[PDB]
Symmetry: C3
Subunit: 503 residues, 3 copies
């Protein structure tokens, strides 16, 4: 054994790459112009409280922008606030309030209907996309790091523009969206705020993934967008957990009035310089499905802010989930089924253990702890920090302070928002090597999740384990106007014998 001889290179500064006539070219350009926007009104007046069917119907010739946007405006009256409350850095909007408010949507392009679930799509997509991409989808793209929001918390999403570390990554007032607070008289227990939110529609086949430079659709003889509107306070309005209530009242009462909506699209003629448009254009339009869910009452006997190891280890196991093909990715989360407080963060559980079964291969990931589960999710796109993901006590010293009495320790305690575990079939390390992403092969999956919840000792709430699948799914636009979509399925042998790409 002797070391092999290696070739050498002489590196030098890029400064010495002299610009000359041999390597410098002058660019002119064409672009998608900004003179091409159109406002599309809905077929009927939108419901005044934001609850009802909403339809846009507008044939569009030539090219239409791939990421159309919805512009909602409304007034929100918040009641049962303690008198003379400043409300500084305490009121704002929830993350992706437009898409949160649309449980189901149907898009018609030239007779082809696409049915999808925006609220469900954006609930997953907010946790595994680039934050700068997400800031182009919505002005309220920041996702809650912690299960309670307090005014003084450093990344409090309801911090105003001047009080935010990064105003783009806040959902407060004076940040990314237009607003107006109605005049507040001395001794008033309510506030009225007008909002305007301009947000991209997350629904098949829109190009919300490629929001930076979306590929346009062409020659839409029929173009209908049908929305199941649920623009209700619970989906849109955010109130910090340290805002005080009037004596007697349990929660805040919020009413949406003056609700209006329109769709904003770009429409323009293709330039001659790009040449002939191809006969068949392909669009990346992934399919998210809830593969299985199961719920249970979770009662905490021991303090969630106490010893981590003594926190109640709740277990939920799904039924056997039958799948006719193998998805590219899965997503696991344990969420509160019925929210206790309507205007607080979504209460997810901190997943401490994960057992997965695929066919007869059992007990996968049972060995793994939180740190390894965080790495797993992070390697598949998870976009938040461990402090959030873990669901652990985030302010231990604040709670352990002797100045805080035993009765006030839960109130001061703030936990990480909770876990979302993204995993691929290739992460499982299955004996059955035919179980590959995009394989046309039937499988049965079962997922057990061990988790801890942020509820106080002697209290509880219902938590649902949800397992989602993210499938590769393409939409094809044919020259004659026809649209089709289908999964990109192949045999195991085709996929295993495909050429290697080390990336």
């Amino acid at each position: 054994n002797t070391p092999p001889e290696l070739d050498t290179v002489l590196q030098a500064p890029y400064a010495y790459n002299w610009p000359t006539s041999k390597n410098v070219k002058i660019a002119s350009r064409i672009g998608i112009p900004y003179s091409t926007f159109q406002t599309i009104q809905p077929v009927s007046d939108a419901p005044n409280n934001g609850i009802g069917q909403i339809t846009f119907n507008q044939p569009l010739g030539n090219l239409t922008g791939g990421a159309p946007r919805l512009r909602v405006s409304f007034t929100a009256e918040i009641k049962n606030i303690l008198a003379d409350s400043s409300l500084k850095d305490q009121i704002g909007l929830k993350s992706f309030p437009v898409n949160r408010s649309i449980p189901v949507a149907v898009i018609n392009m030239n007779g082809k209907t696409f049915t999808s679930y925006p609220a469900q799509l954006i609930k997953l997509h907010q946790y595994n996309a680039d934050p700068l991409e997400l800031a182009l989808l919505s002005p309220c793209s920041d996702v809650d790091e912690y299960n309670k929001i307090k005014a003084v918390s450093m990344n409090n999403p309801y911090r105003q523009g001047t009080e935010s570390t990064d105003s783009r990554m806040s959902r407060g007032l004076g940040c990314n969206y237009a607003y107006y607070i109605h005049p507040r008289a001395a001794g008033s227990t309510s506030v009225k705020i007008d909002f305007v939110v301009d947000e991209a529609l997350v629904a098949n086949p829109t190009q919300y993934k490629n929001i930076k430079d979306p590929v346009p659709f062409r020659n839409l003889n029929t173009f209908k967008v049908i929305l199941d509107g649920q623009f209700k306070p619970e989906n849109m309005i955010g109130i910090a957990d340290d805002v005080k209530l009037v004596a007697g009242k349990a929660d805040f009462e919020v009413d949406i009035t003056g609700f209006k909506i329109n769709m904003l699209v770009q429409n323009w003629v293709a330039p001659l310089e790009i040449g002939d448009i191809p006969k068949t254009i392909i669009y990346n339009t992934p399919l998210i499905s809830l593969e299985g869910n199961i719920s249970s009452m979770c009662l905490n006997t021991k303090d969630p802010y106490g010893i981590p190891g003594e926190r109640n280890k709740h277990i939920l196991t799904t039924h056997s989930m039958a799948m006719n093909n193998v998805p590219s990715m899965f997503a696991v989360m344990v969420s509160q089924e019925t929210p206790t407080k309507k205007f607080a963060p979504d209460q997810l559980a901190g997943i401490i253990g994960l057992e997965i079964k695929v066919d007869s291969d059992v007990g996968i990931f049972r060995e793994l702890e939180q740190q390894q589960l965080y790495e797993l999710s992070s390697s598949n796109g998870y976009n938040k920090r461990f402090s959030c993901f873990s669901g652990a006590l985030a302010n231990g010293l604040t709670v352990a302070d002797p100045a805080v009495a035993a009765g006030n320790k839960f109130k001061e305690a703030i936990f990480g928002a909770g876990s979302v575990i993204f995993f691929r079939p290739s992460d499982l390390g299955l004996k059955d090597y035919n179980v590959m992403a995009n394989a046309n092969k039937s499988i049965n999956m079962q997922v057990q999740a061990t988790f801890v919840t942020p509820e106080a000792a002697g209290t509880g709430a219902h938590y649902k384990l949800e397992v989602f699948s993210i499938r590769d799914n393409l939409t094809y636009s044919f020259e004659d106007g026809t649209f089709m979509d289908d999964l990109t399925l192949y045999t195991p042998d085709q996929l295993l014998r495909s050429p290697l790409k080390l990336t």
Copy 2:
């Protein structure tokens, strides 16, 4: 119609790309050494208060660094400060204080003179470059997000090193630049602060755009830099808007003393390993010009912190701007003509509507709201958030607080610094397709801007609408020592028939 067949690939981790003798190489290197720096003194003693012509005249052989820097040092005495004011996080320097202080500069390279306007150049450039790139130009690269600066504001640019979220993105003391505060006696109403600022000269033909890897100049037999020195307090010194004044005084009085300046350059011999230097070296040296401006008195009758829609919609329309060729980009802004307060942020207006005319094509962008104008500018490099760009009330809850009395609501109100709208000719979507960037074609442009201002009800100030052009302009260095510069102009047919690059 049937979906087409797609080829498949098998992706695998980069960890399996095994390093071997076939794909590993050992590097050595040459570089631009740090033993090559020279301090060039000016031909005569600089004025004590930094006001007057300043000239550097120093021939340099072989290679000279492409981004030469000016190092200024001075003492600033700030008077009329309320007695026993702490001044914590309230005093610093304005953004790009050296280049701000140079209205015009003349650089001579081997007989060829380059006349440019550094204050005008950096005022645009600070809004459309990468912040990290800008931090290499100046230690005071951070640009004001808000029209008022207060001590507690989270991104207050005069926060000290220890109180900043990012010390590189602060202009405060104990950040990127050397300083010394003179001892402050009890009951003193003034402060003396020594400053030293090492900043890259932004003047043609310097390589301020390519600050990371600047291409050097060669064989400068004549090298003169003539500066119109206007290093006056207004251009350099920054004082927070919540610093209290002594009773009687309207504004702070500031005096610059002990002003010294020198030019820092790198000078070295070209190494043999890079080979022959080309006969003609090309330098990117863009030409910024004020194509038109117009001003008028803007009086606000209604409150700027009140209803956004009821804010006074001021209009300014330029005269017809005749241009012999078509620039690559335009920049629009509406700013205070005469600053009210000398040491506050530059007051820009929030542009709510824009109307552009090019030849007989009229009313372009009249349909666009603020969100779309922000998108437009951001797509062309605009480097700040919507909270800043909009000019909207940034701290609504703080103002709407009942604890704040009616007379103090304006004092509490903080607005976005205001708009700068960058747009290209291709963004306009003109019928006349021959109007291309870098086309040798005459055009007449006219710009109408609708805007809102941050002044209180029953007050006003003069605002100027400025339209700048950014032209592609190259400087050519010939082997015999000669320097020329010229625009990169072509026929519309040449540019339209050029090969496609989709990027």
Copy 3:
């Protein structure tokens, strides 16, 4: 002379790069699974106070993960705290506490021993790596910007999860690592905290540099990891400088108990789809060595918070450092030899001047100021801001405040943590062109550093100038199981005649 003709290109958006069957492909994949993790216990129980030799001995077949991790758990009792101290944002761990605690480590792979110094390695590596890479190595990756940590400081590294601007870049409780604070009774002067830290071992030949996608090791039939355990309070525990002591006590007393440790590895069989694993695998395993050091008592007569120019200019000059070959990089730093306070940041000096001698070439960099030394270090990967690097007074206004009496001015003063100057041989600009990185040429180096220290007037401490070398060094893994390592040395003529790579 005339400007040359330049070719033109027509640029267009990426949106017109239509996805079709000609340019779209469907990926399935294989990966390094997350079912492959294994816990390795040490051969004997670890010392209860974390002090002593610790050994792992576990043969592993097939592929083993290239970046193995050490998981330590312990209880830390902190005494002499003033009664009823809240301790909010004032307790955490120091940076890279596991690797800090290992002065020397020996790794055996198939009979080949690699002796390295993790505490020394990580002390350099923390300053010249990408922060996101460093966060994958350790949950306490954030390095101190300042020489004192106070609770209210904006980037205070002991800010809790909820109080941090970025919880990943904090070392506080409720951030990246698991913890539990034991209950605190009223009037108690001590606190007990359980910690669990999961950190990558920084020791040859581990793949800590390629932490994102590390290349695995093959067939470790002998695999031993021998650690000089120094997991003592001084290396692990962090306490803010504004935590108050009980009367009579000079410093805090800290005890480590219940110390346990294990090694986390991945172990798996290579998949058939990647093909044959090459016979000889190469691993990047750089060699850090302390080339010279010298110490001295540094007594400050004048105030460090006073006039910067009047700060005591201490000088230290190394003896002649004989080297048989030329390293790719050097690192210079001036550190406090014996820490005054065990739980404060590492006190480095602010280097204001650097004089280097190489053979008969003398006085290199004597001309350079702090700004240029910062530029030099930054160009070779230095990852901190100037406010830290300089060692300058970071909070001048806070100190200059008349409200702060003369006796309390030093206490309020906070300085940058200090300088680390990375430089290459190519930065020196030597007349002797044969002195190239990776050359087998003997050289003699001497380094003089002029610096300022953060100690008060009438006090001092011992400071050591250290000069490190960073050599390119490769580890070769042959098919039979043999491991070798060696430097990548060549002749000056080989390296100079090698092909150019302008990057």
